[PDB]
Write a protein that binds this ligand. Structure first.
Ligand SMILES: Cc1cc2nc3c(=O)[nH]c(=O)nc-3n(C[C@H](O)[C@H](O)[C@H](O)COP(=O)(O)OP(=O)(O)OC[C@H]3O[C@@H](n4cnc5c(N)ncnc54)[C@H](O)[C@@H]3O)c2cc1C
Ligand SMILES: OC[C@H]1OC=C[C@@H](O)[C@@H]1O
Ligand SMILES: OC[C@H]1OC=C[C@@H](O)[C@@H]1O
Ligand SMILES: OC[C@H]1OC=C[C@@H](O)[C@@H]1O
Length: 566
């Protein structure tokens, strides 16, 4: 009665794709475990304009970091969805992908079959784009038909009430004048430009299109798909046979009544609990760094000491201005390259960055206590440097939002900081909060590029024709940060005001085992026959865009690889 073909741990963004796709075969039983519950009727979730409302609610995990010692010492909340649909139920709904070359880098580092060309069909498979109406087109909405799916479970589109307004027009003009042109679609692998970006939105219903509305509810009549809500997976348990290679037998779970039981998988266990939980589930299962496992009285089943290592996150800051009159229009994204941000000063930045890479690697070696090697980190950091410097991938995302009335706000983040940190269990008790350390601001580039982006936004606000609409900068403003402020003043302000960008990746990184990878190119955990991780943990580097689009694609492709292996 407790045995299924597949168990999917975590009914979130990625997990629901896998469960949907594997359950397409009516002879295959799939169990979805989700710690949260349906949010189908939760108004903080459905509200197309509700971003932020669910923060700190019962559907926000509100994980917390350790003291961020490079960023001024304060702990940071790392938000995540506790709900059927996971973090897709609380996020900002922005749908943007990745630069083609940064996916190509996955195959370059040794992950066979992972390139932009290979992944594109899976972005398409996931997506159902509603074409813009004539009023949305007038507002600046656009897409390239060749790179947007029409039939996928995930509805994508623009707010029915998108309208032309003075702010978005002026932003387009002002960015073009700065050398950054409008692009019709940031989702065809070339992200550089200004764009009126689409959202994970059911345009007809006018509700947020979360992963459960996309991949679960339309298919909940399937008799071979089983869901356990309010059910927490604690750890995997293993078959007791002869092979050195570990074979997962099942998952230990805790139900709502607090009872602890076992469910079993005949084929595979897929862990999709998020970048801040999936590596913990591995550690509690005996897969991880033996020193950490032994300190917590867990016998290692697999010696894989980079479980929870290579944590990479971005950090988010905000600026604001005030108009002479009412400011209106679409929200806009700009993806500037390094030369867009730093202009005729880029060569000095590149030289300084180039000179710092070996030192960044050496610092990062110690973060994992030597479990990533100097040589390996130098090569990984060189790949990131080359994307920034040679391929000119965007180094920032800059959002502008009308704030109602005369307010305009910008939120922005450096896309490719070098800081790596980690996440590890704090005890053998599955309910104990983990030690999460993203190492924000660890490296000079990380903070100084963020300062360069903030300065760029200050310059944009004061540039023509936008400056015809903007009376003053209000945040930070010229009192807090004088026109003559040194870089340190900017960095200090940024450290005082930043938050996590809630973009963590890399804690079960897809890389060859010999360079510190946790999963292979089929997302199988090294040392196991039948355990996979399918969620943001597996991305080996940050991507330029917003995570769900890529996680849906990765989960779509992973589903085919699982099917092939069966
Ligand atoms: C505030 C915020 C804003 C964001 N803005 C955007 C945006 O605009 N656009 C975008 O594309 N991305 C955005 N992101 C990022 C994006 O939403 C996430 O990266 C993505 O949803 C993560 O997907 P996932 O599959 O890795 O994990 P999740 O979607 O977090 O799924 C993990 C699931 O596992 C469950 N779970 C955890 N532990 C257990 C356990 N032990 N047992 C059973 N279940 C468990 C969780 O409840 C959750 O449902 C945002 C994120 C946040 C937090
Ligand atoms: O490929 C065979 C089966 O493998 C796993 C799940 C099912 O969806 C497939 O039909
Ligand atoms: O850290 C390397 C460079 O990164 C960005 C701006 C410069 O101030 C730095 O020297
Ligand atoms: O839509 C903007 C959001 O997108 C990504 C994560 C959050 O930090 C941002 O506010």
């Amino acid at each position: 009665t407790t045995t299924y073909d597949y168990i999917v741990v975590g009914g979130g963004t990625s997990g629901l794709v896998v469960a949907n796709r594997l359950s397409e075969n009516p002879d295959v039983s799939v169990l979805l475990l989700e710690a949260g519950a349906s949010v189908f009727n939760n108004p903080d979730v459905t509200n197309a304009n509700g971003y932020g409302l669910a923060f700190g609610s019962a559907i926000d995990w509100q994980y917390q970091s350790i003291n961020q010692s490079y960023a001024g010492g304060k702990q940071q909340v790392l938000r995540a969805g506790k709900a059927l649909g996971g973090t897709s139920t609380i996020n900002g709904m922005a749908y943007t992908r990745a630069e083609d070359v940064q996916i190509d880098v996955w195959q370059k580092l040794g992950n066979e079959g992972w390139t932009w060309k290979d992944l594109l069909p899976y972005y398409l498979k996931s997506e159902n784009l509603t074409a813009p109406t004539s009023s949305q087109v007038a507002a600046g909405a656009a897409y390239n038909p060749a790179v947007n799916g029409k039939e996928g479970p995930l509805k994508v589109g623009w707010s029915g009430s998108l309208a032309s307004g003075n702010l978005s027009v002026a932003l387009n003009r002002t960015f073009q004048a700065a050398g950054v042109p409008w692009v019709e679609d940031v989702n065809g692998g070339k992200m550089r430009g200004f764009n009126i970006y689409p959202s994970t939105l059911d345009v007809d219903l006018n509700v947020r299109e979360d992963a459960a509305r996309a991949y679960y509810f339309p298919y909940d009549d399937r008799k071979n798909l089983h869901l356990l809500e309010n059910t927490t997976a604690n750890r995997l348990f293993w078959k007791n046979g002869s092979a050195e290679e570990a074979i997962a037998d099942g998952v230990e779970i805790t139900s709502a009544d607090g009872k602890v039981t076992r469910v079993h998988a005949k084929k595979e266990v897929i862990i999709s609990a998020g970048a801040l939980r999936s590596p913990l589930i591995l550690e509690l299962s005996g897969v991880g760094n033996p020193t950490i496992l032994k300190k917590n009285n867990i016998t290692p089943r697999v010696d894989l000491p980079t479980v929870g290592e290579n944590l990479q996150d971005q950090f988010n800051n905000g600026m604001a201005g005030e108009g002479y009159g009412v400011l209106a229009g679409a929200s806009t994204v700009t993806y500037p390259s390094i030369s867009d941000v730093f202009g005729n000063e880029t060569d000095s930045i590149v030289a300084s960055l180039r000179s710092q890479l070996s030192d960044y690697a050496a610092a990062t070696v110690k973060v994992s206590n030597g479990h990533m090697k100097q040589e390996d980190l130098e090569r990984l950091y060189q790949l990131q440097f080359d994307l920034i410097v040679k391929d000119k991938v965007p180094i920032a995302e800059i959002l502008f939002h009308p704030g109602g009335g005369n307010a305009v706000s910008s939120e922005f983040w450096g896309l490719l900081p070098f800081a790596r940190g980690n996440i590890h269990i704090s005890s053998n008790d599955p309910t104990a909060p983990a030690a999460i350390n993203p190492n924000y601001f660890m490296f000079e580039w990380d903070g100084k590029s963020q300062a360069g982006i903030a300065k760029y936004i200050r310059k944009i606000l004061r540039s023509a024709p936008l400056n015809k609409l903007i009376a003053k900068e209000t945040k930070p403003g010229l009192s807090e940060i004088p026109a003559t402020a040194a870089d340190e003043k900017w960095v200090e302000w940024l450290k005082a005001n930043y938050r996590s960008n809630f973009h963590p990746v890399g804690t079960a990184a897809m890389m060859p085992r010999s360079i510190g990878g946790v999963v292979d190119n089929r997302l199988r955990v090294y040392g196991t026959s039948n355990v996979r991780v399918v969620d943001a943990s597996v991305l080996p580097f940050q991507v330029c865009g917003h995570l769900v689009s890529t996680l849906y694609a990765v989960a779509e492709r992973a589903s085919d690889l699982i099917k092939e292996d069966a």
